[PDB]
Structure formats: C-alpha cells, structure tokens
Design a protein around this ligand. Structure first.
Ligand SMILES: COc1cc2c(cc1OC)[C@@H]1C[C@H](N)[C@@H](N3C[C@@H](CF)CC3=O)CN1CC2
Ligand SMILES: COc1cc2c(cc1OC)[C@@H]1C[C@H](N)[C@@H](N3C[C@@H](CF)CC3=O)CN1CC2
Ligand SMILES: CC(=O)N[C@@H]1[C@@H](O)[C@H](O)[C@@H](CO)O[C@H]1O
Ligand SMILES: CC(=O)N[C@@H]1[C@@H](O)[C@H](O)[C@@H](CO)O[C@H]1O
Ligand SMILES: CC(=O)N[C@@H]1[C@@H](O)[C@H](O)[C@@H](CO)O[C@H]1O
Ligand SMILES: *[C@@H]1O[C@H](CO)[C@@H](O)[C@H](O)[C@H]1NC(C)=O
Lengths: 728, 728
C-alpha cells in the first residue's frame, strides 16, 4: 500500500539527510550556521549567541561562497566568485571584514583569482597564492610581502600542488604549512617543466564557435614526474624593501639517488618539522626530523634520527605513508604502521631511539588516530564484533596500554555501528557522528568522564517521512573462500521473500584498500532499484580490499585486474547458489576503478553475467597517472612489470564481449580518467565486431555530477537495467 | 526467388557490380587494367594487347597504389606509400620507370611525402609539390627546378589547396594547371596565416600513451578566410643557375574590394587562360580572359573580355560558377548558365562581345557539357520524359541549334535511363555508361554515325546471381504540392502487396541542389531493409533540391533548415495517407546534411515519426565552414543573417525530442562536420532531460568508412530500426 522509493525521489533529493557540521574554535566553543546566521555554541551548557548576523552581507553584491574566521577571532575571510578546478583545487576572490569595527577592509585587498588562502594557526596572519607565487599579510589592511618570484602557470608551483600531487598525494591544492606559532611558513615547490601534457577538447556553451583545448601537466605511468623542493621562511623577519629569504630543506641522500616524492609535512613544535619522503618505487619511505638553529638560522635534519618504513609485501601505507601524531614536547609520536602480522596498529616512536613499540594489536585495524592528550590517545578501529565494515571510537590510557575503553560501541548498538568524531582544541569535548546502519545521529560528549551531553541532530523528520515508504533492507555478512572470510552486503527489496527468485545487480568498485561492504546508511540508486524494481543490489569485498590486514590488501600487488576480478565473479556464483537469485538475471556495474573491474568481468567469459555498465573506466594502466598506477603496478618497462601492464587491459578481452550486453559511459572533459580510456575500449570492440551501447557526456568530468548530467546518466542506466532484466 | 538480400551481403559485398574504367590516351586508343595487367585497346577495331605485364614489378618491394603513364608513352609513374589526408588530398612516394628500356630511374628521384604529381599534357615533363613547394622536372632522370620558396606547413600553399578550397571549391588537392603545350605551368597560392584552427583529439593505436591533438586551419562561418594569389611560370625558360620567374595575374578590381575566391581555371589556348572569381558574398562572379605577351613576357586581362555572372534569387552556379568549354581557336566558349526562367542551359559566348546566346531551352536542365567539336556540342540533360532523375546524352548541330539528337535515350530504355560519358581526345569515340534503373551497362560508340561498336561490360554475371535472390523493386514517381511536381522514390519489399501495411523509413539528405529520387541502380543498406526486413525506404526531393530550376533550388536561399525540413514532413504525411504504409511505424534517417534534417524533423513536434537516426549531423551553421555555409546563409551578423542562423539550430528544438526515439552517431576524428556539432546536440538534450541513444566512433572521420567501423555502424542502426519497428 505504501509508496515505493522512486527514481525521482533519488534524483530530486526528496528524502534529505540532515547534517550537523560544526567548526571547533577553542577548547569549549564551536561555530555553526543556523538560518544563515553564524552562531557560536558553548559546549558544556549548550547556550548559543549570534557570531555574525544573516542580515550582514545582504548589501555585499555577491554570493558569499564560504567564510574563514581568524584564530584569535578579530577578522573574517569572505570567499566569493568561486571557480572549481580539479577535485580540490579552485580559484576565488576574497574580502576581509574587520569584526571589531563595522567595516570591510578596502585597501591592499587579496587579489582576484587567488589559488589558496590561509590564516596562520594563531593571531591573524595571512598566506596566499596568486599566479603560482606565495604572499604574506602580517595585518589584513597592510601590503603583502612577496615570498616567491618563480611562479609560472603549468610549470612552477609555489605553495600549491600540481595535478598529481593534488589528486594522489596531499588530497589538497594547498602546499603551505604554518608553524604552530605562525613564525615560520613551510611550503613546497613543484616543477612540471618536463611533465608531458594531456590534451582534450572543451566545447563550452553553444555560442563558442571553436572548441577549446585544455592542456594539463599529467604524468602517465612511467613518464617524467614533477620534481619537488621544500622551503621554510621566517615570517617575523620580513622587509618591505628587501626580498625575503627562504631556507631550503633538502631530501635525504637515500631519496636524492633517484625519482622520489614528498609525502607528508607535519610540524612537531615551534622549531621542529617532520617530513616524510617516498621513492618512486613506493616500497621505501623516510621520515626526516629537522630542527631550527637559532645561531645559523638554518634547518638541520640529523641522519641518525631518520625513521624508515618499507614494505616486503606491497607498497607503504594505505594510499600513502601515515601521518605522525606528536606529543606536546615534540620528542615522541604515534603513527599507524602495519605490524609483523600485516594488521595496521598504533606504534610509539621516541625521536633519538631506533625502533618503535606497538600499542595496539589483533586481527582488526586502526583506521585513524583522532586525538592525543597527556593521558589519552583516541583512535577509530573496526575491532567491535570482528566487523571490518564497522567504525568505533576507542580510548587508551597511556600509563597502561591494555586499559582500552570503547566510547561509542554501546551508545546505541542497533542504530549506530559506524562512527566518526570531531574533538575540540585540547580535546575537552567531542562530537560523535553515527552513519548507520540506522539514520545518522550527531551527539556532543564531554571527555572527563565520557558523558553524553546533548543530541544535536537525530533525523526524526526523515524518520517520519520514511515510514510512509516501502524501504529496502540491508544484509551485511561474510562468506568463506579458500578458508578466508570475505564480506558482502545486499540491498534487499521490501517484503523480501526467500522462495522468490530476484534479479541481482552486482555493484563493484574493488580498488586497492577499498571497502564496499559496510554499515553506513545510504539513500541512492540501489535504494531505488530494490524498493521500486525489486532488484537485489550486492557489493563484495574480495582480495585487494582494505581494513582486514595486508594479506588481503596486498594480494593484488603488481597484479591489478587479477584476483579482484576473479573474486567478484566467484561472489556472484556464490550469490547464485543462494535460493533467492534468478541466475539468468545477474548484471554488473561500477564507476571509475569499478568500471575497469566491470569491464574485465564482462570480458572474462565467465557466463555468469547477462549484462553490465562501465562508467568512466580505466582500460589500460599505462593511461592512468604515475603516482597511483606505479604504487600497485611498478614501472611499465621490460625490466619491471610491462608484461602484466600489457596483460591487464580491457582491450585484450574484446572478443568475449559478444556474450553480454554492454553499456560504456564517459565524460568528454575527464581530466582524471581520460576519455581516451573508453575511446580505446570502443575502438577495440568495433575492430572485433561486437555490438554494445555507448554514451558520452559533453564537458562532464569524472564525477558526471552537474545536476542535469547526473539525472540523465541514472535515467539512461535505469532503462538499460530494466530492459536487461525484462522489467516493465 | 527464396534467398533474401542480407545485411552481411551488403557488408561483405557478396554481390559485386562490375565496372569498365578506361583511360583514353589518344583519339583512338585507351588503357584498361585487367587483373593486374594494363591492356591497350584499339577503339575502331576492338583489338588489344598487354601494354604492361603484371609481373614487371614483382621485385619492387612495395605494393603499388596507382600508375600514371606519360602522354608520350615513354615513362610510367608508380605511386606507393599512399597515406590519406582529407577527401581528396594524400601523400605518397613515386618512382619512375623508363618503358622504352625496362629500368627504374634511380637518380634525382621524386621525394618521399610528395603531396601532388602531374605529367604535362604533352610529352613527359613532371610537376610536383613537396613540403608545400612546386618543383619541375623537364626529364625524369634530371634534377628538378624549384619554382616556389615560400611553402610553409598550414600557412602557405603553393600549387595545392588548403582544407576549404580542397573541400568546397576545387574538389581537388591539386592547384596546378599545365597549358595544353606544357610550356606554362599556372598555379594558385593560398595563405592561411590568420585562419583559425579546428583542434581535436586523435587517439591512434593502443600503444600511444598520450592522444595527439590534430590542428587544421579551417574557417567557420564568418571567420577569417584564406587569401589567394595566381601565378603563371614559363617551363621552357628554366635555368639551373637562376631562380624561376613567376608572373602574377591579379584578381579584377571588382573582386579586390572585399574578401573573394578563385573559382575556376581553364586554359583556352597555348597562350590564353580563363579565370573565374567569386566574392565572399557569392551572388556575383567575374570571368577574366588573360593573354600572354610574347614581347614583355607578361599576361594581360582586358576588361573588354570580362564577363559577369550574378544572381538575384540566390547564389551563382550549383555549387560554384560553371566551367567554360572553349572552341579550339579560343575566341569563344560555351557555359551552363541559369536562364531568364531560372533553368540551367548552355549559353554561347563570343569573347569581345556583349551578352551570350542560349543554344538550349525548356523546363529542364543541362547537367554538363561533355565534348565540343567543330560541328557538334555534346551535353547531358534530364530532358527525356520530363524526368529530373534521368540522364541522357544529346548532340547539337552547331550550324542549327534546333537540331538536337538524343544519342542514348532509345538505346535500351527499360534498363537504361541514367547515363554518363567519356569521350576520346578530339571525341572520335565515346564510352557510354548507364547506371539504372537496371544493371549497369558499358558500351563503346563512334561519333561519325553514332554507331554502337561493342559492349564492354554488361553485368550478366551479377544478373544471374540476383535472379536467385528476393530482390526489392524501385518506384520512381512524383506528388503535387502547391501546383508543383515533387519527385520521390520508394524501395519496396519483394512480393509487395498494397493491401498490407508496411513500416516506412524515410532516407534523407535534402542539402541544396541534392537529388535523392533518381533512376540509379543501387545495392545498399536500403536494399537489405526492404528485402530482408520488409521495410519500405522512401526518399523525397522537395524545396532546395536540384536539376528542376532555380524556383525550387533557390527556395531555400538565406533559409536553411526551413522548407527542406517542412517538405520532408509533408512527404511522410502523404506517404501515410497512401494505403500501404503503417503510420505508427514511420522512421527517418540521414548522414551529414541528412543528419541535420533528420534532427530538425525529429525536433519539429510533427508527431509523424516514431524514431530517427542522425549520423554526423550539422547542428548549428556557425560551426560549419565559411565557403559552403555563407553560400546559402550569408554572414552571421545582425546586419546580414544572424537571426536565421540562431533560429535554425538543432539545440533550440531539444524539448521536442521527448516525443521520439533518437540515435545520434558521430566520428571523433571528423575534420569536416566536427564532433563539436553532435557534442552540442547531446548537451542540449541533457540540459532538458530527454533520453536518447548515442554512439561515437573513435578516430573515424565524416565517411566512417574503415571496414570495421562501416560494418559496426550499419549493424548498430539495423538493431535500432528493428526494435523501433518491433521486428524480431
Ligand atoms: C585516504 O586517501 C585517499 C583515498 C583514495 C585515493 C587517494 C587518497 O589519497 C592519496 C584514491 C585516489 C585515486 N586518484 C582514485 N581513483 C582511482 C582511479 C581508477 F583506478 C580513478 C580515481 O579517481 C581512487 N581513490 C581511492 C580512495
Ligand atoms: C558537384 O560538386 C560538388 C558537389 C557537392 C558539394 C560540393 C561540390 O563542389 C565543390 C558539397 C560540398 C560539401 N562540403 C558537402 N557537405 C555538406 C556538409 C553538410 F552540411 C558536409 C559535407 O561534406 C556536400 N557536398 C554535396 C555535393
Ligand atoms: C625554478 C626552477 O626550478 N626551474 C627549473 C629550471 O632551472 C630547469 O631548467 C628545469 C629542468 O627540468 O626545471 C625547472
Ligand atoms: C591496340 C593494339 O593491339 N594494336 C594493334 C596494332 O599495333 C596493329 O598494327 C593492328 C593490326 O595488326 O592491330 C592492332
Ligand atoms: C608568403 C606570403 O604571402 N605571406 C603573407 C605575409 O606577407 C602576410 O603578412 C600575411 C598576412 O596575413 O599573410 C601571409
Ligand atoms: C553561554 O552563557 C554564558 C552565561 O550566561 C555566557 O557568558 C556565554 O557567553 C554564553 N556562550 C555563548 C556561546 O553564548
């Protein structure tokens, strides 16, 4: 009788999840936006005031995209004229507003087309990047100091990342790091001079008579990478008539030997910086510890205090070497490291001592370190009930490592199994964020005795509405393969009957260190497919998946397109032998890495799958970027791993596609997984005489995320699946 | 006849048409290659010998693409290493072979990557173009003379055409014209300095890591055009000590005023050249008659012999001003011109005299002048039986214009209604070739008494095969609209039955001066659809179509995407009201201009069509090239024709596509109708939420002609049409 969850509900965001995004501003207060007011909340009591009225900036004359308020809170940055670049990068204009006065600063403004801006961590200093060069304002209404003069578009990057560093290393556009004082400004310089360029057409509005050619420095597998240098400037000693001095910190000898990456920059104290470096063969990394000399005014990284992290079985880290969390005095730190068993746990390092001490252990993994006080370290793990797809906050007493308390496990075990956390400065309070299996729940807690303070957002409005709809359910469980537990989830249609045979859609990603079987609550395409179309949407975490130790994660080493493709095939045969799937209506779809696996599955000749959809897939690893590809594959040389680079293409399997119905989709302005990749798949299918379906999205990138394109692609894909499953 | 005409019959050329391509080498002999042997034929008697044995070049080491024998029979050009550029252009390598001996010439070879080669019309002088420069050899074994020193890739073209002149004007890569003596070499020079570039990706073989960007000087509508200069060089006065001297013939004062083009080049005598020029606004053209000055070494074009061809109702010529046919003495010529009533007929021009004399008249059109003697003019018209889609050879006694013989009409009237002709030098003999309605038939005749000599190829081999296949039939008729006849054709299924109702596919082109209803015999996709799938395939020649007078052809002046679209809709409507058509199953499809019309029809909201396919369509006239577009559209300025440019796009009709099923196909390496055109169509449909089907062909151009791609596109369109029509 109830209404079902329709395609229009998903596409038009009918049932919206409520959030509670706060920004901690001290040990005891946070900011929060309510009816476009910025409010300040008191954590202990819950009382709030208005930080900045909504009626302010009504007369501004531009839509304010974002704000950033100075640490010692006298000013606010007004971000406007936002223009997106890649995943993280963008460009905007900035006004500064004097909070103690009534006024906007009208003099010595931050330029338009600024690439990145940051307040110092204390006070109100400003560092920004404009035309690839760094600038510093000591006071908001005073002239900026020019730190660098070398910045050149697409060639020299000062204080910002280039394409690969942004995407694959720092996950940020920024390459600026203030010291905790704000005295020193550390920054990276990238040089792309010999990095080859990827070129593609941008069609723009119909009024553009000639297409534009977009050109991006982008190193493909085995090509010339950018080079990096690292600098630190003393911001306290700047002159308005004399160019500033930047002291270079050079990478260790064991890196300078060949191609290498800067991997991590972490300030330890007011005068000590930590730097991680990684070799182009991502087997070997080095932590440098560099102290400032008050005498010479230089930085020195003592060779004897270098920490080395290498891997025997795979690469280093999950996607990169993990970051250190330093103790207040800067002499010791904690870092997630893979133990002797291959499970990732917290190791304790002391700076002039050689090894480290493991502080956690077991057949589970630490996801992240979240806070460190003198008495406690707070971390998230998937320990609870041996479920790799669950997430919980834990707390260790530093006086006794075996004294561990779960802080979130038993708060609401039916509703809440997937937490993240946001601590205040000094971690006097924390916000817990639950994500599933039930509706998201946001709560405020106090650290002293771990008291629940206040519920912040419980999604009761959403709960009301969803009782009027035939919601699907989710099963999360595991199967055994060669004496090993591999997890899966199923999104089961309402009124699920185990004697009826249902069509199954296999939803795949399967990238290295991925997880698609978990406990989070989602409203998405699969929700629609199960609720309205009565399709089972399964996902499975095979070899190469993350969070279950290295034996599973590193099984895929030097061998992408291999075990992770077999394990999706085998999971579907498994699901077949369960009594409720129609083994004649098994489909497969995935996006990105998911597209590659879908395509590799479809060209396998398994016979299991009737049809599949690949959206923006990798087709050949030599087409993807160097930092990512080479991490899992090594180099595409006969000396190294060429043979498997050449055996793991989608193209090589073109004949086998005559046994399946295939939908290939790609955005034309994909800067990440180039349209080229699908252009080669289709060319190979034509050459072999294999009919299939295609769809390009003009001027869309990897997300195909514009409002109209997003609605279009999901509409197109639904038709294809329904016709494949003979659904009306 | 049991077995049907299949898709695989079409795709694999199961039923090959035989041809008889001969090369006249004198008044009374021709060359003809048979297997790999070049034979020489005597026209009067029929006897023949092998001119060049297939064995001759067994040990050459390259497959030869083509041959060219010098007009004196002493030497042969061997073309190999053929690489296609655009529709007509290509590069190749050339060796010369002395025939009197039996030897390859090894010194002073024609270089690799030669862009064009031509023998003089008499003897064995060679002229060639390499790296955009002209060279001349007086003797095959001797060093070549460099004529031009200004050639520059994509900038200066000497003796070859740039993209637009090749495609739109000359239909040739060549821009060289030897005089009938071989004394003078005339040539054009093109300057693309300021012409904007179309840029698109080319992905190449799988091995290519980074796609290429192809960049072509290509003026879109209203953009900066190339400039042209004309030069004549004397080939008898060349020195291997001094640089060659090129004499410039400048355009007439009435062309020099604004942008213009070189239209036509036709030598009159050993010392007289004819030149036609056209204003960028192509309703005004000027013919210049230029004579050589023996005393000064110059060329003068007197205004007394200048002729103006202009048009009040449209543009000049069918696609360009027509070529002159001069009498031997060079003092007069014949030319196809639109008469007072707007029908195209032969005018007789005397060189220093005003006006011209129409020698033909009537409500029909001369297609071409084919040969001129002292006693007779030979031309092709559609006069016979008042059928615009028929073609016959005629003969005029020049002493009395009213005395016209039809030479081909009654030769075989049920089988043969569409002729072309090839006359020998001095026209003592002619090859007639008929193309339909029956199987092609090749015959030889002598001009003395117009006696049939010999049948050359009668396709009797194909006739027997087709006897054993269920072949469709062709209906050619007309319908009346206002008070005008508009012709159509239907390919009808075998065993057609007017009491039954058939699905109907409209096959559309409908560009200006097109004819889709003719008497030609074809084996194509439509053959398969009628024979195997029992679909009627209709084509219709409405307003804008050719060979019926300017009142019909010029209807579309300044107004593309109007009447020609309207008329196709009416045609389909009329076919509905015919008792043998199922009006719930009417489709439409077209390529290039036809894809544009298909789309405009599908976007019309007429309700007549269930589905349609557009291959490589134009979507907006500002995207197509200046020379073709401005001919019909004028300039896209507010003081010219911007409003109808803006009102005739496919994109603006996007909302209307929710009422139909649409398949859109484009090759990504289309240098002619750019992928941009379909890219914009798809974006418009997405912006408006219309589902449709798509298919790109990576690296395919306007023809989508590579054997795998050709097979793949027609397979794909066959599926689309079959499911649109509910055909199993
Ligand atoms: C936790 O931090 C990270 C998480 C993740 C990543 C990087 C991180 O930081 C380095 C990478 C970056 C990579 N570019 C992305 N891929 C794979 C490509 C298809 F094979 C297409 C594409 O966009 C996959 N994600 C997976 C999740
Ligand atoms: C008889 O000589 C000619 C015959 C023809 C033409 C030119 C001639 O002389 C130069 C033109 C040239 C034009 N480029 C071509 N189109 C139209 C475009 C679609 F809008 C895409 C495309 O390729 C259509 N053809 C039709 C036949
Ligand atoms: C500012 C800077 O570092 N520029 C360098 C330049 O010295 C060098 O020629 C090039 C080599 O790739 O790398 C870049
Ligand atoms: C084309 C050809 O075969 N030509 C020959 C010709 O050389 C010969 O003189 C004639 C009489 O035998 O027969 C013919
Ligand atoms: C060889 C030649 O004619 N070059 C010309 C050059 O003189 C001129 O500056 C340009 C203007 O577009 O066109 C080109
Ligand atoms: C909360 O209330 C206290 C006591 O009235 C007040 O001093 C404080 O400013 C309040 N905090 C906020 C954020 O309004």
């Amino acid at each position: 009788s109830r209404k079902t969850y329709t395609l229009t509900d998903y596409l038009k965001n009918t049932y919206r999840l409520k959030l509670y995004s706060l920004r901690w501003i001290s040990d005891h207060e946070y900011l929060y936006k309510q009816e476009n007011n910025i409010l300040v909340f008191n954590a202990e009591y819950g009382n709030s005031s208005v930080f900045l009225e909504n009626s302010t900036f009504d007369e501004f004359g531009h839509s304010i995209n974002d704000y950033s308020i100075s640490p010692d809170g006298q000013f606010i940055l007004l971000e406007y004229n936002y223009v997106k670049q890649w995943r993280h990068s963008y460009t905007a204009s900035y006004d500064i507003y004097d909070l103690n006065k009534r006024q906007l600063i009208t003099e010595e403004r931050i330029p338009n087309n600024t690439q990145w801006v940051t307040w110092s961590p204390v006070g109100h200093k400003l560092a920004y990047v404009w035309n690839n060069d760094i600038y510093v304002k000591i006071e908001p209404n005073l002239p900026s100091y020019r730190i660098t003069w070398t910045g050149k578009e697409d060639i020299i990057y000062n204080g910002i990342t280039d394409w690969v560093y942004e995407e694959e290393v720092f996950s940020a556009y920024s390459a600026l790091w203030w010291s905790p004082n704000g005295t020193f400004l550390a920054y990276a310089q990238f040089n792309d001079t010999e990095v080859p360029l990827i070129e593609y057409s941008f069609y723009s509005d119909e009024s553009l008579q000639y297409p534009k050619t977009v050109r991006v420095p982008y190193p493909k597998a085995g090509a010339v990478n950018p080079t990096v240098k690292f600098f630190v400037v003393n911001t306290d000693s700047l002159s308005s008539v004399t160019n500033a001095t930047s002291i270079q910190i050079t990478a260790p000898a064991s890196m300078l030997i060949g191609d290498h990456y800067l991997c991590d920059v972490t300030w330890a104290t007011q005068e000590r910086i930590s730097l991680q470096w990684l070799r182009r063969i991502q087997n070997y990394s080095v932590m440098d510890i560099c102290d400032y000399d008050e005498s010479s005014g230089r930085w020195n990284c003592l060779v004897a205090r270098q920490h080395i992290e290498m891997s025997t079985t795979g690469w280093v880290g999950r996607f990169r070497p993990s970051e250190p969390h330093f103790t207040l005095d800067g002499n010791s730190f904690y870092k997630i490291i893979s133990n002797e068993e291959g499970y990732r746990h917290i190791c304790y390092f002391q700076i002039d001592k050689k090894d480290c001490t493991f502080i956690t252990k077991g057949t589970w993994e630490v996801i992240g370190i979240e806070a460190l006080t003198s008495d406690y370290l707070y971390y998230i793990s998937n320990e609870y009930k041996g479920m790799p797809g669950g997430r919980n906050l834990y707390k260790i007493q530093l006086s006794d490592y075996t004294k561990v308390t779960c802080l979130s496990c038993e708060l609401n075990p039916e509703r809440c199994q997937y937490y993240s956390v946001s601590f205040s400065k000094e971690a006097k309070y924390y916000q817990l964020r639950c994500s599933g299996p039930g509706l998201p729940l946001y709560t405020l807690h106090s650290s002293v005795n771990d008291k629940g303070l206040r519920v912040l957002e419980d999604n009761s409005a959403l709960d009301k509405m969803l009782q009027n709809v035939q919601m699907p359910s989710k099963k999360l469980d595991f199967i055994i393969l060669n004496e090993t537990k591999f997890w899966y989830q199923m999104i089961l249609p309402p009124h699920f009957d185990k004697s009826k045979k249902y069509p199954l859609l296999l939803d795949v990603y399967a990238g290295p260190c991925s997880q698609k079987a978990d406990t989070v609550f989602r409203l998405n395409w699969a929700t629609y497919l199960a609720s309205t179309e009565n399709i089972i949407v399964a996902s499975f975490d095979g070899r190469g998946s993350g969070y279950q130790g290295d034996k599973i994660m590193h099984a895929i080493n030097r061998r992408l397109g291999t075990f992770e493709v077999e394990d999706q095939i085998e999971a579907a045969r498994q699901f077949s032998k369960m009594g409720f799937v129609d083994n004649k209506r098994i489909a497969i779809w995935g996006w990105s890495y998911g597209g590659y696996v879908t395509s590799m599955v479809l060209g396998s000749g398994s016979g299991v799958f009737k049809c599949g959809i690949a959206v923006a897939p990798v087709s050949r690893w030599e087409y993807y970027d160097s930092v990512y590809t080479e991490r899992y594959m090594g180099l595409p040389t006969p000396e190294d791993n060429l043979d498997h680079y050449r055996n793991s293409t989608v193209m090589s399997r073109a004949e086998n596609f005559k046994q399946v119905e295939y939908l290939l989709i790609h955005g034309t302005a994909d800067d990440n997984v180039h349209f080229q990749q699908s252009a080669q798949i289709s060319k190979a299918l034509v050459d072999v005489g294999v009919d299939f379906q295609a769809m390009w999205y003009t001027d869309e990138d990897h997300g195909i995320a514009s409002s109209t394109a997003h609605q279009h692609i999901y509409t197109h894909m639904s038709h294809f699946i329904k016709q494949c499953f003979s659904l009306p």
